[PDB]
Amino acid sequence: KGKLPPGPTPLPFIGNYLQLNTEQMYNSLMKISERYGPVFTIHLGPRRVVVLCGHDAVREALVDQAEEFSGRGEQATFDWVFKGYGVVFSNGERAKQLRRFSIATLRDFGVGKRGIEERIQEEAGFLIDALRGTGGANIDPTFFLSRTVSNVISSIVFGDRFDYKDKEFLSLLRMMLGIFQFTSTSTGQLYEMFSSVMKHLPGPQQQAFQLLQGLEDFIAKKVEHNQRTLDPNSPRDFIDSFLIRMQEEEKNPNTEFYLKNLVMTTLNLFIGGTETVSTTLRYGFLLLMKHPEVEAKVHEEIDRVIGKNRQPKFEDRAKMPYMEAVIHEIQRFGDVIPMSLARRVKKDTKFRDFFLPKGTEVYPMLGSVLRDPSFFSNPQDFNPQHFLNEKGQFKKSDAFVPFSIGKRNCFGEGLARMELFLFFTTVMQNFRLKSSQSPKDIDVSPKHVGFATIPRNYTMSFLPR
Ligand code: HEM
Ligand SMILES: O=c1ccc2ccccc2o1
Incomplete structure (x- = not known):
């Protein structure tokens, strides 16, 4: 045909706003998908976006035409502070440079190696101490989890961990939780369409901007301190390494290594490496309380393979297919980032007999892949069997895409998987979970879904085993 994917007819400026519910963007798009197909065009306010639903559409685009779909689209709330700088929201040469440097630097600081594994085990031990500190009292686990997770990436980018009692640290965590919540609310999704007017109006979006500004200021302050104490031959952390590269590049007028990219990249890693893992842990504990029989099975596996004395280690995962399936x-x-981070076609593209002009934004609907009925027997239920064959051995799924796939996929994926495995296992090895309500009454549907999937607020107690 040589036309853009079909879709509902947009009105000037507002796009398809009248055919969407900002409080449930995912459901609004899936409903529209029923009518036009898995690949369709929607107009989010003035933004023309091709929506990809289901495994096949998503993989065909992001992997089979990986380079064509390798551009970065927008996320308006985050672009307010990033403005196209930094590794996540950048494009072209800038993205290419900052991404290659970031992956290399994270490796030099132990990611994917024994170095970061010992750092995560150590922090997991601090989480255990903190949980024993509650004496089995009913608590809100939110910041217990985020303080522990954040301290892993914080160790890498800032050189050391924050004290759990540090009040500025809790402040930063509140900013991150606050921004992920805002981008998942109806106003946050309304902002994705009308930022051109809303960035200048009073409202919830202004407080979100202040949380972002708060985080940027903190990073700019840490960078200044590292700067006036830097040893060019002995970097302490990600920031120092970047400062060193910036020194070497002072003679290149076209370098991507300058202050703004350092501040934005560091902020991207601090937020990306904190809130995503934190939200997953929080959701998982709630899911385990709703499903006690699954927790029991986890406990049997942990006691058999690891036992009660030594700390779990990452290699233990090879011997624990059940925990890996869980x-x-x-x-x-959890479907934490349900519509991924927007991509954009790098050049004029032919996709399934559709025409996607260069620059077109793309919404890979990750949640529609994670729940594809063609890959999971009961997509709407929580069931570890979705990842186990008949003998209870771990079984991979091509529809397992929470870190997305392709050329701009999550490069924090290895760190996240190690954190998820070591934190879930070390906590479950030491405690059994007690909910404040009968498992039948636990609501695991999300509190908000937009940019992220946020679970409902809850309290629980960690009882020693
Ligand atoms: C459970 C944890 C995590 C989830 C579910 C997750 C999810 C994602 C997703 C969906 C993307 C967009 C991929 C795309 O455009 O195709 C992404 C990108 C990214 N993630 Fe993660 N992430 C997680 C943890 C981390 C961690 C721990 C870090 C930090 C080291 C991190 C850093 C990044 C960065 C820098 C990008 C942007 C890559 C680029 O634009 O080239 N993520 N992540
Ligand atoms: O700055 C950011 C904001 C959101 C986000 C989500 C997943 C991975 C990395 C991210 O970085």
Whole structure:
């Protein structure tokens, strides 16, 4: 045909706003998909976006035409502070440079190696101490989890961990939780369509901007301190490494290594490496309380393979297919970043007999892949069997895409998987979970879904085993 994917007819400026519900963007798009097909065009306000639903559409685009779909689209709330700088929201040469440097630097600081594994085990031990500190009292686990997770990436980018009592640290965590919540609310999704007017109006979006500004200021302050104490031959952390590269590049007028990219990249890693893992852990504990029989099975596996004395280690995962299926099912059910981060076609593109002009934004509907009925027997239920064959051995799924896929996929994926495995296992090895309500009354549907999937607020107690 040589035309853009079909879709509902947009009105000037507002796009398809009248055919969408900002409080349930995912459901609004899936409903429209029923009518036009798995690949369709929607106009989010003035943004023309091709929506990809289901495994096949998503993989065909992001992997089979990986380079064509390798551009970065927008997320308006985040672009307010990033403005196209930094590794996540950048494009072209800038993205290419900052991504290659970031992956290399994370490796030099132990990601994917024994170095970061010992750092995560150590922090997991601090989480255990903190949980024993509650004496089995009913608590809100939110910041217990985020403080522990954040300290792993914080160790890498800032050189050391924050004290759990540090009040500025809790402040930063509140900013991150606050921004993920805002981008998942109806106003946050309304902002994705009308940022051109809303960025200048009073409202919830202004408080979200202040949380972002708060985080940027904190990073700019840490960078200044590292700067006036830097040893060019002995970097302490990600920031120092970047400063060193910036020194070497001072003679290149076209370098991507300058202050703004350092501040934005560091902020991307601090937020990306904190809130995503935190939200997954929080959701998973709630899911385990709703499903006690699954927790029991996890406990049997942990006691048999690891026992009660030594700390879990990452290699233990090879011997624990059940725990591996459970963590996969938590990320599949949790669907933390349901519409991924927008992509954009790098050049004029032919996709399934559709025409996608260069620059077209793309919404890979990750949640529609994680719940594809063609890949999981009961997509709407929490069931670790989705990741186990008949003998209870771990079984991979091509529809397991919570870190997305393709050329701009999550490069924090290895760190996240190690954190998820070591934190879930070390906590479950030491405690059994007690909910404040009968498992039948636990509501695991999400509190908000937009940019992220946020689970409902809850309290629980960690009882020593
Ligand atoms: C359970 C945890 C996590 C989930 C579900 C997750 C999810 C994602 C997703 C869906 C994307 C967009 C991929 C795309 O455009 O195709 C992404 C990108 C990214 N993630 Fe993660 N992530 C997680 C953890 C992490 C961690 C721990 C870090 C930090 C080290 C991190 C850093 C990044 C970065 C820098 C990008 C942007 C890559 C680029 O634009 O080239 N993520 N992540
Ligand atoms: O700055 C950011 C904001 C959101 C996000 C989500 C997943 C991975 C990395 C991210 O970085």
